[PDB]
């Protein structure tokens, strides 16, 4: 049931719903709507798609100085090991972005060119 709902707006007062579900597995799922349809994206795909980085930056960004709390530490350990075990072939931003452009080509309707 644990979910971060957020309503991301643009400067023309349009918006877009973005939902973050906690899983019982170790991943965090992402809902976003598009043209009376939604999708589910693992969040570390989005994280390494924004910027090339290391996992230590993710550790320093989420939990910070709260390193004795081994609960969230083991959650993040689940997240990183499950991400780089489920698809270890993705090791920069460009591979993941072209993976996204292949997975999301025939619905945004820019397919014959871009």
């Amino acid at each position: 049931h644990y979910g971060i709902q957020i309503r991301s707006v643009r400067p023309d007062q349009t918006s877009q719903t973005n939902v973050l579900h906690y899983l019982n597995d170790g991943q965090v799922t992402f809902r976003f709507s598009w043209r009376k349809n939604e999708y589910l994206v693992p969040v570390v795909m989005i994280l390494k798609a924004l910027c090339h980085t290391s996992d230590r930056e993710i550790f320093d960004g989420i939990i910070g100085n709260d390193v004795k709390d081994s609960f969230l530490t083991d959650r993040l350990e689940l997240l990183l090991r499950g991400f780089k075990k489920r698809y270890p072939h993705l090791q920069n931003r460009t591979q993941v972005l072209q993976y996204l452009g292949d997975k999301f080509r025939v619905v945004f309707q820019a397919s014959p060119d871009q």
């Binding site: 290391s54 230590r56 930056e57 390193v67 609960f71 083991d74």
Partner: protein
């Protein structure tokens, strides 16, 4: 260094192969090719507890003096 059961490279900080799943004397990185540590690391271990929420009892309410 190692933080709990989490360790990364001292230069690139990438996630590494499990030292309790390797066969060699070192740990090879998933992106670079470096050797850290020499496998004589302080062993992978954590200390975890409960949260004083998941265990309900009237005996717990007796501790609310």
């Amino acid at each position: 260094s190692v933080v709990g059961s989490l360790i990364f490279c001292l230069d690139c900080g990438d996630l590494l192969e499990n030292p309790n799943a390797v066969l060699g004397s070192n740990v090879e990185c998933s992106q670079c090719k470096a050797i850290y540590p020499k496998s004589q690391f302080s062993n992978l271990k954590v200390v975890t507890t409960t949260a004083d929420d998941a265990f309900p009892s009237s005996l717990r309410a007796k501790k609310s003096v």
